[PDB]
UniProtKB/TrEMBL annotation:
Protein name: Glycoside hydrolase family 88 protein
A biological process from GO: carbohydrate metabolic process
Residue ranges crossing the lipid bilayer per the database entry: none
Taxon lineage: Bacteria, Pseudomonadati, Bacteroidota, Bacteroidia, Bacteroidales
GO function terms (MF aspect): hydrolase activity
Domain of life of the organism encoding this protein: Bacteria
Organism of origin: Phocaeicola vulgatus (strain ATCC 8482 / DSM 1447 / JCM 5826 / CCUG 4940 / NBRC 14291 / NCTC 11154)
SUPFAM superfamilies: Six-hairpin glycosidases
UniProtKB keywords: Hydrolase, Signal
InterPro entries: 6-hairpin_glycosidase_sf, 6hp_glycosidase-like_sf, Glyco_hydro_88, PolySaccharide_Degr_Enz
């Protein structure tokens, strides 16, 4: 019933609104950088040269770097926004787009800083770089994109080694979902209704990450079956906690704690389910109903007439139990997530 023509109209409405309203000359930090992952997805689907130039202009403005410190003795890997936070993954997601742009038009300068930073990181003995679940989306696809360019096998071994540490802190083996960081595991932390607290956008980042890993990881990689198994298990756990309306609530298995629609988790999940079905890793008959409800929510409720995307949970605000997300809450990174879902929906329609 829905056509590719109609989906492309949506994609272009959303993307043109964002690019007309916002200049590309802004910093390479995670929120802008996630938007660029969405834009690169649109470029893959459409070949649009203006959209490509928007990402190139952003990369040029940031000098093809993330955080800019050239003093490795001061490099930090915890949260920060100043130039020494070079090893913090929110300053590394930009490298996904720099690698994508390099593949189109190779020039050593485009990946010089990415190689410098990730190769230094991998040389250190520290393993707990991905100490918050969102890091998986920020950095796992960097590993496969940099491998694709360099063929340096350490990228693919360290992908596994870092993810193993993330799992040790956050992965709940019984449930098949990730806690958002070390403060959240059960039973020491519980929801208002005594449940395990799994953050939706957190698990969205992880689930979309594994799809992106599997999209570019070589077929022969020794850990590929581990990633497929993790992706398939998460798909089942995520499906099981979808709301009747098609979205996922911010606390995935306590909808009453943080009620009502939320878009960014939903869009990341939708991307992952559509990619999984399109790529033969998730059963179409089982998961197509999940994606129909989710996409219908995204198209009907999150999408506004002018291309704005609403109901995006904001960044870094303390949880207020019982309080809904504002319909009008819209952020770059959420538009990015929406575009991933929308692009993959076109591919699902054939």
């Amino acid at each position: 019933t829905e056509t590719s023509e109609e989906l492309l109209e949506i994609i272009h409405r959303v993307n043109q609104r964002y690019q007309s309203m916002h200049k590309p000359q802004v910093r390479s930090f995670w929120d802008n950088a996630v938007y660029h992952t969405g834009n690169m997805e649109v470029c893959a689907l459409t070949g649009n040269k203006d959209y490509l130039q928007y990402s190139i202009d952003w990369a040029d403005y940031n000098q093809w770097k993330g955080a800019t410190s050239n003093n490795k003795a001061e490099w930090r890997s915890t949260y920060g926004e100043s130039p020494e936070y070079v090893l913090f993954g929110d300053w590394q997601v930009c490298f996904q787009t720099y690698a994508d742009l390099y593949k189109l038009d190779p020039d050593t300068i485009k990946i010089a800083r990415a190689r410098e930073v990730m190769e230094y990181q991998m040389s250190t003995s520290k393993l707990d770089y991905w100490h918050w679940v969102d890091a998986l989306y920020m950095v796992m696809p960097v590993m496969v994109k940099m491998y694709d360019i360099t063929k340096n096998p350490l990228y693919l071994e360290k992908l596994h080694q870092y993810l193993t540490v993330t799992d040790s802190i956050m992965y709940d083996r019984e449930v098949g979902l990730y806690y958002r960081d070390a403060k959240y595991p059960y039973p020491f932390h519980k929801t208002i209704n005594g449940k395990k607290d799994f953050w939706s956008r957190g698990d969205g980042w992880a689930f979309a990450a594994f799809a992106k890993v599997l999209k570019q990881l070589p077929a022969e990689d020794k850990y590929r079956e581990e990633y497929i198994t993790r992706f398939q298990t998460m798909a089942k756990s995520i499906a099981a906690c979808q709301q009747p309306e098609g979205y996922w609530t911010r606390s995935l298995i306590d909808p009453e704690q943080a009620p009502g629609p939320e878009t960014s988790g939903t869009a990341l999940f939708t991307y992952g389910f559509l990619w999984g079905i399109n790529n033969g890793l998730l059963n179409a008959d089982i998961y197509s109903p999940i994606v129909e409800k989710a996409w219908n929510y995204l198209k009907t409720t999150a999408l506004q007439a002018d291309g704005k995307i609403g109901y995006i949970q904001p960044v870094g605000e303390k949880a207020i139990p019982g309080q809904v997300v504002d319909a009008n809450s819209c952020f770059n990174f959420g538009i990015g997530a929406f575009l991933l879902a929308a692009c993959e929906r076109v591919r699902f329609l054939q």
